[PDB]
Amino acid sequence: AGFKPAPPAGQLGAVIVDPYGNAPLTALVDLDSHVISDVKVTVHGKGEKGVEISYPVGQESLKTYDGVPIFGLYQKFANKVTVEWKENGKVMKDDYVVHTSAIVNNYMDNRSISDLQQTKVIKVAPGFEDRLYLVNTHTFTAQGSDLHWHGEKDKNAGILDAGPATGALPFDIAPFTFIVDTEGEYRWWLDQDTFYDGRDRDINKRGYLMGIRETPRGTFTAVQGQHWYEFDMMGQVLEDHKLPRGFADATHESIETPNGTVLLRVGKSNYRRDDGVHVTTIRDHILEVDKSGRVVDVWDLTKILDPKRDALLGALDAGLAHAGQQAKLEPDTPFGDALGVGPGRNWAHVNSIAYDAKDDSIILSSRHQGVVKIGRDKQVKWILAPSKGWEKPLASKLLKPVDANGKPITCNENGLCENSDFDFTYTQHTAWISSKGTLTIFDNGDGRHLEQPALPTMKYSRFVEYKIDEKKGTVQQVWEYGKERGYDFYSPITSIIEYQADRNTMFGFGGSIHLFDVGQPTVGKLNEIDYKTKEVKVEIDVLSDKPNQTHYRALLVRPQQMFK
Amino acid sequence: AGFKPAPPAGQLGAVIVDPYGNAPLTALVDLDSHVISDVKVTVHGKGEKGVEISYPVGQESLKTYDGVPIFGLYQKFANKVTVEWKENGKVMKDDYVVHTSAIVNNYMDNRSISDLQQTKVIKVAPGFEDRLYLVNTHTFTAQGSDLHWHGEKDKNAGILDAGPATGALPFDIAPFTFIVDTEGEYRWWLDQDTFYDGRDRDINKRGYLMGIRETPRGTFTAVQGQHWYEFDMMGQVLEDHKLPRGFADATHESIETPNGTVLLRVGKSNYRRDDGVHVTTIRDHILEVDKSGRVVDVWDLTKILDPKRDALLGALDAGAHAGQQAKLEPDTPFGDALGVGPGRNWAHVNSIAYDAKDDSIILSSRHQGVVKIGRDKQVKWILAPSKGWEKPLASKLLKPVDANGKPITCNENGLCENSDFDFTYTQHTAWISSKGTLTIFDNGDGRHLEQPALPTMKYSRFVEYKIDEKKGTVQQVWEYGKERGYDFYSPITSIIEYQADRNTMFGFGGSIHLFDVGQPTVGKLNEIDYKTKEVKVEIDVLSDKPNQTHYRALLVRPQQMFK
């Protein structure tokens, strides 16, 4: 004999904790050749106020896992799990005790407050107890940024000098990926080693895990460094693709379209500038790729927008900590991940993508320029931004602010409006299309009205929603929130909103609250705001495990959709 | 810085050889940020009778490779290549001299005749000089089969005994993957390290590279051991998927459907038999999987067909001990062995065809026949001699008919009276031609459910059928090879596929002379005129070790490779 496999737990197979080895708060009930249907799983709340997690499991899932997927376990706990099915026409039920192990943070040093990120529940309105949020955050590595792309030497550089760096390889950090419930408990953990290894020098396993977005299959896409991925809630890495050889440094976003493709935000490696110098470009290219990893289309933004436009670039906050100081651009800023104009500098900093199925177009959030729609035809359709700095042909594409009745609102070139609640967005994020059809944006608000304010705390962020009339070329602000909440609700970077049709709320995550508060944990604030009354239905704070460490994004995840 | 990159070769960028590192007879012309269109590549023939290779290159390819793909080089040679394009409305052309290195066989030993498999051009009709063929063949490793799946110990077994083996892990061999032109020159090579490593004991890089099929994108799918793949002619691995956790041992076939899914042939690991014993089943499940590697559907053939049917199994060549008829036993231990029941090689399914018309699959069972099975998991029809089949299945058997539609009388063994009609035996590649007919490679071992008096009395056929599903009849409408006898007999493997572009039947017999101890095995590439039956192409491929079968070959077209 050798060693036997786990024996059957009840009326099906063994119950396997973490089948794929990437998700320790998950398990699987082995099917053991049983033919079953009507499968329904219930993970009971831990103790008194504990949140219960419940979902149906589809056939494709049962077939793919060869078993019933168990999602929503607590760490280091004797979880109580109920699985119900139909077998041979008869109704069946098993009760399992599924013991779990611990969540490990593999990236800790003297900066660490503790191992895990802390949660504080601030508000949970009745009827929102069941909400689950996936938090896409990260934690500093001991080493810090240790690698650069090698670039091309400029003719004006010292003859003796080594070659310069290029691109944005140092944009690299350990991931911290979990689902939190409304009691503030971790109910899912993605092992950090799934995608990342910050101790090895294998660039295939470095980067910044970002752009976690749900697919039509209830699975998720993601980007990290030079690869893009698809994974599921069982921790199965379903796709792992290298970027096509011409491109590098995928960050911020990955979204599956209805046509089966995936949009990514990358840079072009070995991009030849008009002066013949080769650079890796920064955050200014869009790819459409298929599940074969092949390029279906590319948008080179350096030829579509205006890379010499510094209207917003010059209005920016230097901040860490050289904070509260307006960015002074320089002609000789060396190429690299650096504020500046031109291909090879961070002139666009595109940070989100939305696919408009209606006209086969894409909407981009550019942190440093504004928000634009670009066609399949590579033509600018419209731009949402202050008018300053834009030249013709592009100035003609700026949308015109109007009111509820459609009458022009009067705005200066800096985007400051007269006698109106209307305001443009500035250093914004997640310009997405809601189920309503409108354009929702997280208006971070750094460099608002194209200047820094008199004092540093005079900043605020907004959840805003616009209605756009494309034929008329008009934009109407139709909803906003957070303007009154001041610095204490200001995320200078990252962050996301998304409209939730099911309970008519606006979901939001402010990812860098108190970023600049030296020695203080950064706050990620999960919010759900009632769309009609503007009341807080959910407010949950996530505190970084090291001081002054931004979070990136969060998602409202629904267990009902996870296992098609 | 420090060391500079390759400089531009002509008017575009550098020309890199084997950019992905898996295809040493390819190159890439870096785009270097040039905006180009109307691209056309030409690789010139080597010497006097050398075959030129020419193709257009699409925008998707330009964008994917960040350059112009150069396919069809010769090894260890100063290839002459011409690239034409349009840029700023101007017509542009470059001529490049692209030097290549050598093709390496990493699996040689005292059995090796030489390093590479030898090609002999026998016949090339005018107008067929341009043809290219991808040969999916293999080469023995020094150690042979070295790993087994662990099975469950049987209760009739000894108390002290170690557990048995199960499944088919030993089905494992180094790949030998190349494209040959009609001068018998190698024009493409897939490095053996791309997918395989027979020296390491990482099961993820083991198995039997098989089922190389073109996709709608001009790329190819393949299976090997516990993974399935997609790659392209630049040697880029586009997909690499583990089989879903319930399944094992993917062999023989992989085909992309029009719905974006892929059909695979696997076995079930930890399959619970009715007597409670768990086994890895052998070559009797079909998976439909999506490009995420998830299971869209599963056909469990042990519940759809009849695993107890020994009609054809009992009548098989044992081949060390070839020639002999296979005497089955009730106690054959579970494993990759001839036998009945789940956990033995009762079915040995070796090809799949998706029928888009009714959303069903056509399967070739080496040991049972050819069957259509529906999305609903119901048998729609069976092409096979009637012996051994019982109701409810017996009634799905197709009935042979003539050109006018009248019954052909056949005994239960598939022997027909006064007819060219014959069923298929131990067959392969039951596919659906562009005509809508069923093409099969009829290997012919166990023909008429018996062994012949003499081994040399065996023959193989290309054969084609017209099926009326409504009427439930089958009509043999084309055959070839019966009259070529033994020197055309492939006991195993092999394939045919109807070519509409030039009305030929393409064929590859993979195991000609397999049983001639000490002799190279012959893989014969053939294009046969569909009307005249004239041999338009015949090329023989000889194994680099004796008694080493080839699997399949494909007719590849350069103008489809780079979408």
Next chain:
Amino acid sequence: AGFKPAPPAGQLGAVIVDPYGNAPLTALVDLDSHVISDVKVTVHGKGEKGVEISYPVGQESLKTYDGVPIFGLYQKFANKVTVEWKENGKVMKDDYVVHTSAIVNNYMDNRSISDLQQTKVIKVAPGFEDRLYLVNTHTFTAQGSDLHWHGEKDKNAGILDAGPATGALPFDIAPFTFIVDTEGEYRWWLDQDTFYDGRDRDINKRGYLMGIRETPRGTFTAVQGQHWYEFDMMGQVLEDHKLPRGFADATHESIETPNGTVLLRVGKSNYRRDDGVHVTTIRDHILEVDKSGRVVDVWDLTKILDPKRDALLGALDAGAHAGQQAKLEPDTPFGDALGVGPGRNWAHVNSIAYDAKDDSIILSSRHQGVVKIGRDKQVKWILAPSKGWEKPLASKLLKPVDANGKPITCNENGLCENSDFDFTYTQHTAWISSKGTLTIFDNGDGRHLEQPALPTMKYSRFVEYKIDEKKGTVQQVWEYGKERGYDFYSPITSIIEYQADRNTMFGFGGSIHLFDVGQPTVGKLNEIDYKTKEVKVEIDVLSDKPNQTHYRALLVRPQQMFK
């Protein structure tokens, strides 16, 4: 059972080609549980003037390989091999025909002249026909240098600027590693994938394969990037160590001591300068490490020597912009660049010798000279022109003397009056011959701390010295090459080593014609008679791409390879 292993070839086991998968011109005769002794292998020459290769094989090797190691095959050939042994007191012999595959260069592009480096046999004196030489050379990758270490941003730098680079990660190139016989045939090849992968971005498989040195076991040590290695002539990787975490960028040398430790040349990562800025230092630390990869000792040369000394640095060829004298600057950014101070290439140490007699190390500093440093971390003596050196170091300078022991008068630039005596400049391989003398390859760039009127006025020397450490004197006792002029001038790399078996000076000039734009670079293998100065061997190796330096070569002996 499934697929059988290779069967026995003769009276032992199967004969496997490239058993470890890294050395395609080797084979192994499986022992198959035979108990043998007195083993001798003979690989016969190819054709008329072919060099036979013969050697004994020890019990340790038999046991390690589980078989008889076959070394010295030709590529793509039916090698004839004879194996003799003793078994049960009977004398035994087998003759094997061992077929091989081809040698592959995986790094080719439009710069490629052809796939392999070309060899030209110029001179082979009788009694030197058997000589074998391992050539440690390299080949440009398509992309060139693509990665940098990230450094610490300097406070005099722009607020908006991204952080700078540091260290020498770009020092990275595909290896080209082979053994040539005196017919100029390749008799061994180390697969480039053994250690390197220039297509992937796994830094563990990057760098510059260097410092290949024989060990007391007849195996070899090497360094590449962030790892050090030990391998043998069967292509077996015996050790693979990461550098200790404080260190980076191992280049140029690796030598095993008699105490079981290994000496390496690295840089320090996160080295804190006195101004508080952290850098990866360049080529200025020596590690002694044990076979566990642990640090036994460290020599930090930035505290032992003088990093501010620009005597030789200021006088260097800039070579794109070759010929020009190097005009140093105070603001040269830290990095792999000519300059003073920690974090610039002030030292560029390129060889190490352990002196067992007093437990000290002799170093060659390309930019400073030759120095002995003790276990105690004290400078024992310095071989260099006196310019730029200040006390306390100035006083450790050796003083030149004649055969009778009398002073030779030299200016501060190393120009001597009425003497053959000259110091070394930008030199390499300051080793200790079996005679106890110091041998150096005097490249000669920056000779006499100046550039010449004309570039063609440069020459290189083999040179030998007798040092009295007690007296503090140095005596030039042998030189060669000054009178061969430019066609013998190696600006960089290169090596010599005294051969006692036949009283020759072995040499390899690695960069002959380096600056002839568009021309292959020449690596010249030489054995020079120590008494007569007659050229006993001269073989030229030509780079596969223009202007591509070679590093080193070693004289290898088959009868030592298999302990």
